[model samples]
Target: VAQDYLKVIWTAQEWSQDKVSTKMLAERIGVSASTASESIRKLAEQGLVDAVTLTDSGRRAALAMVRRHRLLETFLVNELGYRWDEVHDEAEVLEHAVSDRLMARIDAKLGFPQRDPHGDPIPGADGQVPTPPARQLWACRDGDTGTVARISDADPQMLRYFASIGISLDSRLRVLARREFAGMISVAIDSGATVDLGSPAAQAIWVVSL
Candidate 1:
């Protein structure tokens, strides 16, 4: 439960503000707030998780869990031929079960991948996650060109939709126009197709200038 709490808090910090509430953790784990708070209190006592940000030990633990999850996801796809969208569910179950020795062996087998199939960064053994400079796709101006950097894994349906199209990491896209009133951004992808993304999709993608 402590590792679970740390993992969720680490993810929440990435996509949302750092100040995580018991209710948020509850919703993420499908537990009651009372149960979450009880666990959180223990975490706090153990110096693993705090209210807003994690302590040094907490961050290290969280990053270790993150590393395990991302590495498992990569292994599932590259070794077992699982689709990027299909690996998350299975990895979710396996992340907590894999031993450290098993993980190290898998890492060696996969050539020490830096990112998961969906483009989420894998923390190093030292607990350092590489962070590249990027901006949200929704923030790009008209006529801007950039390469897709990251996509939020919050929605599996959205991931499948992007996969159905040809948008994945490293795809180049140009912002054709933005229709603020319509809440859409027209983009020309490198695959010879023009598409419009709604706010949710646009906001979920991060891009770096070409």
Candidate 2:
């Protein structure tokens, strides 16, 4: 249950602004608050989780379970011939069972992938996940050219969506216009096709100058 909770918190990092609370954990695990608290307490004792209180000490401190879970996921999918959809549950199980030696073996097998199947950066064996450059496709000034640094979501549907539109990591893009108020991006993809992304969508795609 603790490992299950950790995976939830790791995936939540992409979308949520705050650390996951007990309520969210309960929802993810389908358990009572007392049960969730008990599990969290155990994880804390094991040094896998740390408890932090919100302003009034009412909320749980945010969880940092992103490192190995996603790293293993990347390796499993990219190296072991597992489908992205199939790997999540498998990874959920193996991420906890996997050891440092296993990570090293998998990393070497995959040739040390820098990012996961979802486009998130994979942490090194020392738990060092690369801090991707801060620039976003939407933030690019007019006439700017950039390389896509990372993508935010791992949803297979989203990956297919990007594949269809010809935008992906390591690909170069041209920014034609930026709209802050409307949150829209008018851009040209690597395939020389024009595409428009909503502000929210644009923010999800981090990039760097070409």
Candidate 3:
């Protein structure tokens, strides 16, 4: 339960600066708000979470879970023929069951991958998780060159749509223009094809400046 709370809190921090509330936690974890509050209270008592902010110990626990989950996803996709979209749910289950010894062996077997199939960073053995220097794709202006760094894994359908459009991790793209009225950004992929991404889709993509 402590690990689950930590992981969700960390994931909340990924896309926004909003504080994690009991209601939000409940929604994210599919628990009652009161149950979420009780969990938070217990976590605070145990020093695994602070109920208000992310603590060092909390971050470490969260990273360990993140590492396990991402590595498991990578293994499922690479070895077991699971699609990227299909691995998230499976990994979520396996992450909570796997021991450290098993995780380490899987890490070695997968050659210490830096990022998962969904473009989420994998925490290192030393507990370091890389945060790419990236902004929402919609934030880029015309003439800007960027590479897709991270794609938000919050929506499985979004990932499938991206795959259908030939957009995946590390895809190079140039911003052609932003149509303010339409709330869309025109992007040119390296393949010379152009596509318009709506604001919602644009915000889901994180691009590193080139």
Candidate 4:
């Protein structure tokens, strides 16, 4: 999968505002600074990562790689009748081991779908992002409500636990309590059942204010 590459790309913006230097990537990927520097130098020479900034086309290739990843994730579950929880890694492998034609074929075969199973917007064939306005579910306040937009796949366990709680894409929920000290969020799902989830679980979900 392109996760490690995509990891570097977004960590530049999300983890820090500055360009990811060798030391940063070193600590991030758990390698020595010199080793990180060398790898980055190699990637830069190959035009995959930038010397100071990630290359534009590098980002494009990652997104394009991601399209197949997410699209295949969608196809397996919806069409091939795969167990939803089981296909994430399968699609990750298929993303690179397969061909572009594989996804292009599935894209049209699946009616040119707009988003993935986890609610990530499929990158347009135009090579553009069409992300919806989404913020972390943990960012919501006690009185606020929102629809689950994209459940973060950063931790696959969170995905399974979220499903165990009956949350899904488009599940509308209201925050009933924010127990900051306890690091838990109590929410009413679909205004019926309530569940108390830790910040770790809540952090893995993106919600759209409706």
Candidate 5:
């Protein structure tokens, strides 16, 4: 339950600025808000989370769990080439049952990756998180090329789309054109072909000027 709360809170931070509400958490976890509150309180009791401000110290502890979770996913996907959609359940089941030492070993075995398959940063063995500034692809001007930095939301379809097209971390992409009225952006991939990613999909992808 603590691990579940950790994942919920960490994923919420991606979309909600770490301001997780019981109602949203409950909905995601398929529980009543009161039950979610109680579970969060238990996590607080264990020093894995804090309800007050949802503080960094609390989130860090939760991030340790998330780190392990994503590392498992990375191991599953990169090494084993498991389908993105199928790995979620496997990772969720393993995230709760693993120990700190085991997670560290897995991290070492994976060459200490900084980010997971979904572009979320993996916490280090020491529980340190790499801080990448959030940047939207639409923020780039025409002719500016950028490296795909992180992706905020990774729906199964989005994952499949990117994977099928070979767009992964550090993928060099350029803003080929931008449609002002529709807010859509045309991006030229490193592969030399251009594709139009929907405005929202483009926004979900964060990048740094290359």
Candidate 6:
């Protein structure tokens, strides 16, 4: 429960700019507000967190679990033949079960990947997350060229759709245009195949400017 809460909290810090409230955390964790507040206090007492302030110690603890989960996902895909869409749940379960020494060994065995299959940067041992100047696809101006840096793994449904269209990590994409009226962004993929992405879909993908 501790690892789960911290990972979700830290992920929201990067994935969304809005402040995540205690109420929101309760909702996300499928617990009552009182229950969530109690756990938050527990964490604070343990020095892993100070509720929502994200202290230095809290950040390090969160990043450590992030590294464990991402590394486990990479190991699942690279060594176990699990598809990108299938690794998240498994990793969630294993992240708490695996020891740091075992996770480190797996990291070395997997050749020390810097990013997961879905393009999210893996937090290293230093406890600092890699920061990239990446913007959501729909936010990029028309004619901007870039590569897919990260795709939100919140939905397996989206991953299957992306897989069907060959939109994996590092896929070269060029913005063709944006039809604001229809809320659609047109993009050209590596093969120059133009695709129209809805605003929601575009918002889910982060692109690194070339």
What are the TM-scores, per candidate, against the unseen true structure?
Answer: 0.95, 0.72, 0.95, 0.83, 0.86, 0.95
lDDT of each: 0.86, 0.67, 0.86, 0.75, 0.76, 0.86
Could you tell me which residue pairs clash in candidate 4?
Answer: none
Encode model 6's per-residue lDDT on 125-171: one tens digit a residue. 98867766688998888899998889988888888888888788889
Q: Give lDDT tens digits, candidate 2, residues 1-210.
A: 655765566556644467778777888668998888887777667555562222211112222235566767887767679754566667767766777677777778878777777567765645455766647666678878888877765455655567677777788888887877767878887847799888867776788887
Candidate 3 lDDT over residue span 6-51, tens digit each: 8888878876788878898888888997788888998788787663
Clashing pairs in 3: none
C-alpha RMSD values across all candidates: 1.3, 4.9, 1.3, 3.1, 2.4, 1.3
Query: Model 4: how large is the Cα RMSD against the reference?
Result: 3.1
Better by TM-score, candidate 5 or 2: 5
Backbone clashes counted, model 1: 0
Candidate 6's error at 110, in angstroms? 1.4
Model 1 TM-score, 2 decimals: 0.95
Candidate 1: tens digits of C-alpha lDDT, residues 1-210:
768789988888775565788898888878998888898888889877566578899999999999999999899889999887887777888988889999999999999888788778899999879875678999998989998887888778998898887889999999988888899999999847988899888998998899
- Evaluation by TM-score, superior candidate among 1 and 2: 1
Among all windows of ten consecutive residues in candidate 6, which has the lowest summed lDDT?
48-57
Off by over 4 Å in 3: none
Please give the distance, in angstroms, between residue 82's alpha carbon in candidate 2 and its true position after superposition.
5.0
Off by over 4 Å in 1: 16-18
* Candidate 3 TM-score to native: 0.95
